[PDB]
Structures are given as structure tokens and as C-alpha cells.
């Protein structure tokens, strides 16, 4: 099952809130390298997480940016590896970091690389340009 | 050059300080999307830069992390697009945020994507795991 479709499906699933598909497309024991911003006490910056850890982080993000969508811009494959560039678009519609909602939009780059075996993600690296998002939210005209 | 070699050459050039090669491998009018951490007053987070802007930022980084090296771990290509995962290693020789140098090593992930036309980079996206670097520095 072609690895580029696995990754296109993954982001369609994240956008629609479709946990059943996400569990089909990601192995339970997949190694997920989230950036250091996603670290906590139990999981220091640079230590990997499993699928449910990743989905836990995603669930928490959906609470602050419920209209957020990741759109694949470029996609690149060689064998079981797939790399994507996405754009996350959304609004400041929920209060966060102590600032009440402004409605202001944001558009930030995500870069990802994933290893896909048997139609499922088994390793994944991702980083988002979080500082640019914050800059965009503090600058309308 | 096959695009994967252009990108391997690019990081060999950054590691050795080889500005002549970097100018061969990057078009002058290339669009460089650096992460928001690389912004300044003249160039807000998310605004692109040209080759000389990028090299200017790199030169400035070499003042604080003079032994820093990027090593390509994985590389992936399809047409003109190449994507890489690198590891930046260096040592903590300069005080930051009031915490003194330790001499300890640090290791952070970079992800990159580059468009290569006629053996030269014409567009480039990069992001580094900056928070992990700061955690490593203590």
C-alpha cells in the first residue's frame, strides 16, 4: 500500500479528527520523535514516544486550535521513507498562554519524515515552525 | 549534480567553512525559508531570505558555535525535491541565559527540504529542534 498515500491519509485523518483511521495508519509501537517543545517531565526533549503518546499530544492541541488543518504541500519518497512539507493553518479562537482569542489567522511550516512498513507508520520525525506561528499571532496590520 | 549530492555537498561545505562551494551550490536569488528563531528586526519570522542572507545568518552562528557540524542521517529525493534529516553537534563554550559554558556536547535534529534546479539549490526550508538544544545546554 503506497507509502505516499499512508502519509496523505494520516493528515486527512488528523484534520477530520478520525482516531479509527489514525490507529490503522500508525503502528502502536511506532517510534515518534516529536520536537523538544512537546517534551514534559515523563518524556524529556529528544526522547521518543509511542502512538498513544503522540495522539495524546495531538488531542491536547485540538483543544486550543480546533479549526487547525495541516495541508501537504510537497511530498517526497524513496522506498519505505516519505518526507513531507505541510502548512498548518488555523486561528486564535481559544485562550492560550493567557491571551484571550483574537480570531487572528496563522500559517506555519511543518516538516516531517516517516518510515512506512506494511501500510503503517513505524517511525516518524516532525518539527513545526512554532516561533513563526507566535509571531503571526502578535501582528495583524 | 544529482540533487542528493548537491545537498550532501552543501552540508560538507557548511561544516568546512567553504564559502566558494556554497555559492556554487546555492543560487543567489534562491528563496530560503529559515525558521522564526533565525529572524531579526529587518527580517520577521516567516519572511524568506536570499542566499547572502542565509550565509550571513550562518556566519553569525559560527561565532557562538564554532565547532558546530551538521551530519546527514537520512536523505530522500523525488525529482527536484530533496529532504534530509540531520543532526547538529557542537559544544557548549559560550554562556547563554546566564548559564556558564560546560564544554559538554549537544545533539539536535534538523529537518530540511530543498528544491534543486541545474545542480543548485533554488528553494530551501529548514527547522531545528531548538528547545532540545536549550535543554541540552541547561
Author numbering:
A (entry chain A): 6 to 146
B (entry chain B): 6 to 143
What did the article's authors report about this structure?
X-ray diffraction data were collected to 2.7 Å resolution, but attempts to determine the structure by molecular replacement were unsuccessful, presumably owing to the lack of a suitable search model and the large number of molecules in the asymmetric unit as estimated using MATTPROB. The remainder of the structural description will focus on the unlabelled native protein as this should best represent the natural form of the enzyme. With this structure in hand, the crystal structure of wild-type IdmH was determined by molecular replacement using a single subunit of IdmH-Δ99–107 as a search model. Electron-density maps were well defined for all ten protomers in the asymmetric unit, allowing all chains to be modelled, with the exception of some residues at the extreme N- and C-termini (residues in the ranges 1–6 and 143–148). The ten molecules in the asymmetric unit for the wild-type protein form five almost identical dimers. The following discussion of the IdmH structure will therefore focus on the dimer formed by chains A and B unless otherwise stated, as this represents the most well ordered dimer based on an analysis of the overall B factors of the chains. Two loops (residues 38–46 and 99–108) are located near to the entrance of this hydrophobic pocket and limit the access to the proposed active site from the bulk solvent. Interestingly, the loop, which comprises residues 99–108 and is partially truncated in the IdmH-Δ99–107 variant, appears to occupy two distinct conformations within each of the five dimers in the asymmetric unit. Indeed, in each dimer each protomer has this loop occupying either a more open or a more closed conformation above the hydrophobic cavity. Whilst we cannot rule this out as an artefact of the crystallization, this suggests that this loop is likely to be highly dynamic in solution and may also hint at a potential change in conformation between the two protomers, suggesting the potential for allostery in this enzyme. Indanomycin was placed in the wild-type IdmH active sites (chain A and B) using in silico molecular docking.
Indanomycin is an antibiotic from the pyrroloketo­indane family which is known to act as an effective ionophoric agent against Gram-positive bacteria. IdmH is a homodimer, with the individual protomers consisting of an α+β barrel. Each protomer contains a deep hydrophobic pocket which is proposed to constitute the active site of the enzyme.
